[PDB]
DNA sequence: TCGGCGACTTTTCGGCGACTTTT
DNA sequence: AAAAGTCGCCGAAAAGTCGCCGA
């Protein structure tokens, strides 16, 4: 009895993805919203500069499918270590604001807040359609 | 069978806790109330002026959980030796005023009275809701 | 007596190949 | 045949109680 759902978020690392990863993700025909790059997140480790550059993708599947469905589809796309920690997204509004660290979880924990503009929306991601 | 309860008090020693302990207690997401620093308690031994610096944390679990649980929950958070003497609290109010030694028993036994201003409330600890 | 800790138990949840349904 | 999708099944950690205490 795995959970089937429409909204997912996962991480992409610049190392494990090919050059054209952006055009690579457009192919699937599914609305995505790709956070700006996270080169400046404070690590929960002493003396430690920042966490590694990563992305937060917000993935809007067209029908209820399972976490594993999405992991594998992007594992085919970009390399089997391309992504990590695919999760089911419960509140879309938050996990969109979370790409900027400008949700309330993030500013409450005072994390470094990125630029609205660098978010990349693939196949006409409509924030309003899902809220 | 051990006792289940929602209200707890335990002690925090500044030596055994990391710099960012205060913020790390906020992570647990639980209403806490942290005594002002207890650096001038009268020691019960002759020629011993003060007791070792401590804090009294006042801890409100979201569901009746066991003394031991809270102990694990905090060892893992601040270090195996971070805390001490976790007990269940039967009257919050009295034990709230005890953080300043302004309860009945504290003023009764002539304990050193600290300043409210230094009390720290974590996650919107609202003493009034508890009476 | 009653706070304590290691041993244990129990959820919790994200992986990943293997099997299965869909195209 | 191939794509996509889910199904067992594993592991680890974050949680929790239990056993015995021990001063
Ligand atoms: Mn991040
Ligand atoms: Mn004290």
Q: How far is the CA of B65 from the centre of ligand 2 (A)?
A: 24
User: Measured in Å, how far apart are chain A's first and last C-alpha atoms?
Assistant: 27
Nucleotide of closest approach to A67 (CA, C1'): C14
**Resolved by:** X-ray
Residues contacting residue B113 through CB under 8 Å, at least 6 positions apart? B100, B101, B102, B106, B107
Q: Is B130 helix (H, G, I), strand (E, B) or coil?
A: helix
Which positions on chain C have an atom < 7 Å from some protein CB?
Answer: 2-6, 13-18
- With CA atoms as reference, report the closest residue to B13 among B56, B44, B45: B56
DSSP B43-85: PSSTT--BPPP-EEEEEEEEEEEEHHHHHHHHHHHH-TTSEEE
Domain ranges of chain B: 8-130
Measured between alpha carbons, how far is A96 from A34 in angstroms, rounded to an integer? 9
Structure tokens, A56: 């937060």
Whole-angstrom Cα distance, residue A61 to residue A81?
21
Ligand nearest to the CA of B98: 2
Query: Does at least one atom of strand D sit less than 7 Å from the CB of A75?
Result: no
Count the neighbouring beta carbons within 10 Å of the beta carbon of residue B62: 10
Q: Look at domain A4-130 and name its CATH class.
A: alpha beta
B3 touches strand D (CB under 7 A): no
B54 and B91 Cβ atoms separated by less than 8 Å: no
Among the bound ligands, the one closest to the CA of B111 = 2
Bridge-partner residues for A4, per DSSP?
A66
DSSP string, chain A: -PPEEEEEEEEE-STTS-TTHHHHHHTT---EEEPPP-S----SSTT---PPP-EEEEEEEEEEEEHHHHHHHHHHHH-TTSEEEEEE-S-HHHHHHGGGT-SHHHHHTTPPP--GGG-EEES---HHHH-
Nucleotide nearest to A75 in CA–C1' terms: C16
Give the separation between CA B56 and CA B34, rounded to whole angstroms: 6
Q: Is the CB of B2 under 7 A from strand D?
A: yes
Instruction: Report the first-to-last Cα separation within chain B, whole angstroms.
Output: 28
3-state secondary structure A78-91: HCCCCEEEEEECCC
Between CA B126 and CA B10 the distance in angstroms is 19
CATH number for the domain running over B8-130:
3.40.1310.30
Asked if residues B113 and B101 have their Cβ atoms less than 8 Å apart, the reply is yes
Total Cβ atoms within 10 A of residue B91: 13
Q: Which nucleotides of D are covered by protein (CB under 7 A)?
A: 4-8, 14-19
Using the structure, give the distance in angstroms from the CA atom of B55 to the C1' atom of D12, rounded to a whole number.
33
Q: Are B73 and B8 in contact (CB under 8 A)?
A: no
Ligand nearest B39 Cα, by number? 2
């Amino acid at each position: 009895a795995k959970e089937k759902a429409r909204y997912f978020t996962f991480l992409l690392y610049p190392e494990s993805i090919p050059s054209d990863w952006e055009l690579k993700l457009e192919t699937l025909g599914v609305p995505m919203a790709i956070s700006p790059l996270h080169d400046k997140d404070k690590s929960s480790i002493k003396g430690q500069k920042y966490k590694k550059a990563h992305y937060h993708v917000l993935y809007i599947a067209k029908n209820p499918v399972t976490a594993d469905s999405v992991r594998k589809k992007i594992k085919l796309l970009l390399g089997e270590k391309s992504l990590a920690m695919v999760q089911v997204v419960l509140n879309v509004e938050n996990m969109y604001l979370y790409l900027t660290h400008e949700s309330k979880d993030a500013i409450a924990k005072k994390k470094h807040v990125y630029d609205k503009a660098d978010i990349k929306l693939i196949n006409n991601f409509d924030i309003d359609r899902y809220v």
